């Protein structure tokens, strides 16, 4: 869980005072201390009655209300974004719609506002109740 860096203990330019440190830019360009970051978003459909259940689909303004201001064009016909697609913040990655008791309203979960990355993996399965269950893992480089 670390790397062996060639450390020089010196007062070079005054930019390492008070616990600060100076790192080689060329070493950073060569991959020193570069890391990955994975984040997973989970969603599922909940049953609200005999036939009142949520649906994983791409929502449109013609049949769905309360749509977010983000981008919906990155979704597929199943409401799930394909892996390997570069995405920015405030974008819809999972599209879920729920009926009202324009008979549906948007409940899609978007990406984090201050986070960017690439969709790494998409997992679809079923839960205990028997409805859909989606997990989207996105990967970025720090």
């Amino acid at each position: 869980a670390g790397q062996n860096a060639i450390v020089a203990i010196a007062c070079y330019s005054g930019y390492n005072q008070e616990d600060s440190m100076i790192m080689n830019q060329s070493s950073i360009d060569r991959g020193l201390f570069r890391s990955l970051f994975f984040r997973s978003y989970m969603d599922q459909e909940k049953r609200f009655g005999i036939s009142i259940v949520e649906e994983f689909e791409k929502p449109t303004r013609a049949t769905t209300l309360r749509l977010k201001h983000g981008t919906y064009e990155k979704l597929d016909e199943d409401g799930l974004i394909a892996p390997g697609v570069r995405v920015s913040g405030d974008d819809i990655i999972i599209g879920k719609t729920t009926p009202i008791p324009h008979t549906k309203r948007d409940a899609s979960t978007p990406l984090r506002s201050t986070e960017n990355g690439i969709v790494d993996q998409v997992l679809l399965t079923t839960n205990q109740e028997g409805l859909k269950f989606v997990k989207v893992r996105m990967r970025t480089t720090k």
């Binding site: 010196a10 007062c11 330019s13």
Partner: peptide
């Protein structure tokens, strides 16, 4: 600060 920082830059200091 500026004068002493330049002098220490072009002189050097370390501990061991």
């Amino acid at each position: 600060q500026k004068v002493v920082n330049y002098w220490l830059l072009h002189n050097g200091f370390s501990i061991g």
